[PDB]
Amino acid sequence: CPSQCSCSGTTVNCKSKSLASVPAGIPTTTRVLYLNDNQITKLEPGVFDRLVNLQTLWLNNNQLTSLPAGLFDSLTQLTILALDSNQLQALPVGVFGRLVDLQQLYLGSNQLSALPSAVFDRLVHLKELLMCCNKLTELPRGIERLTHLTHLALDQNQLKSIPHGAFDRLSSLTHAYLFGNPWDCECRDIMYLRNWVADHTSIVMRWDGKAVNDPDSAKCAGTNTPVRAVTEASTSPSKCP
Numbered sequence: 001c002p003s004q005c006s007c008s009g010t011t012v013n014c015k016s017k018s019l020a021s022v023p024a025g026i027p028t029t030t031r032v033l034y035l036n037d038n039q040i041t042k043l044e045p046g047v048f049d050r051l052v053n054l055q056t057l058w059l060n061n062n063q064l065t066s067l068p069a070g071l072f073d074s075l076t077q078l079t080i081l082a083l084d085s086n087q088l089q090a091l092p093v094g095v096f097g098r099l100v101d102l103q104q105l106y107l108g109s110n111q112l113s114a115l116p117s118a119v120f121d122r123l124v125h126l127k128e129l130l131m132c133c134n135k136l137t138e139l140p141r142g143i144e145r146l147t148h149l150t151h152l153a154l155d156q157n158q159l160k161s162i163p164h165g166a167f168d169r170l171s172s173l174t175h176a177y178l179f180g181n182p183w184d185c186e187c188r189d190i191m192y193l194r195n196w197v198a199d200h201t202s203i204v205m206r207w208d209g210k211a212v213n214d215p216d217s218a219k220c221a222g223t224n225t226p227v228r229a230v231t232e233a234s235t236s237p238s239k240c241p
């Protein structure tokens with residue numbers, strides 16, 4: 001056990017310990033690793049290579065700005081990875097490529113404006129993808145193939161539309177967060193999101209400390225009128241960015 005942390009069973013608790021770096025002494029037997037709520041500014045390559053039994057890894061609420069390539073490649077049994085509330089500016093290609101059993105991925109509250117094109121291609125069992133509070137301008141490629149998603153959080157980004165058909169195979173969705181985006185309702189491309197929301201009013205959620213069903217929470221930029229109320233006649237292909 002790291003001297004700054006407490007350990008019990010296969011759980012290592014390094015949460016809220018004012019840590020500036022990942023401490024030594026985490027047993028290779030560890031299955032749950034709390035490193036959240038610290039001041040970790042970077043993760044060294046190979047730091048997780050020894051921890052092949054991890055199933056849940058909490059790196060949220062730190063000061064991470066980048067991740068080295070291959071950082072997680074040994075964590076083949078990982079099912080939850082939390083990276084929210086950091087300062088991640090970009091991700092390397094294949095950063096999640098080996099996390100084939102991952103079920104929950106937290107990326108909200110970073111500085112991401114795009115993702116590598118194949119970032120989710122191997123996450124065939126993913127159920128929750130929460131990426132609020134970044135600066136995304138397009139739906140990341142690959143999300144349309146995460147057919148097992150129950151939770152998809154895209155709120156508080158910079159999305160203007162959703163590519164046609166992107167949500168149609170996400171038939172297990174129960175929670176979709178779309179508020180806080182500047183949806184461009186004069187552009188003809190908004191019609192897919194409009195049509196999809198109108199058919200899935202029960203799964204569009206707002207957030208006041210918790211999920212609250214609100215299909216009007218996806219709002220048009222400027223008028224702040226509901227996206228699902230847009231008429232096609234009011235839109236035009238020539239009014240798109």
Ligand SMILES: CC(=O)N[C@H]1[C@H](O[C@H]2[C@@H](O)[C@@H](CO)O[C@@H](O[C@H]3[C@H](O)[C@@H](O)[C@@H](O)O[C@@H]3CO)[C@@H]2O)O[C@H](CO)[C@@H](O[C@@H]2O[C@H](CO)[C@H](O)[C@H](O)[C@H]2O)[C@@H]1O
Nearest residue numbers: 016037060061082084106108130131132153154155177207
């Ligand atoms: C990894 C994760 O669960 N992230 C979500 C985040 O989790 C916070 C929540 O569990 C609260 C519950 O009290 O605890 C916070 O942790 C505390 C900790 O308990 C304290 O002892 C001390 O250490 O400080 C930390 C941090 O303050 C967890 O961080 O909760 C937020 C919402 O508050 C979620 O973000 C929302 O996600 C929604 C989709 O699910 C939606 O997009 C919404 O807009 C987001 O705000 C994190 O996903």
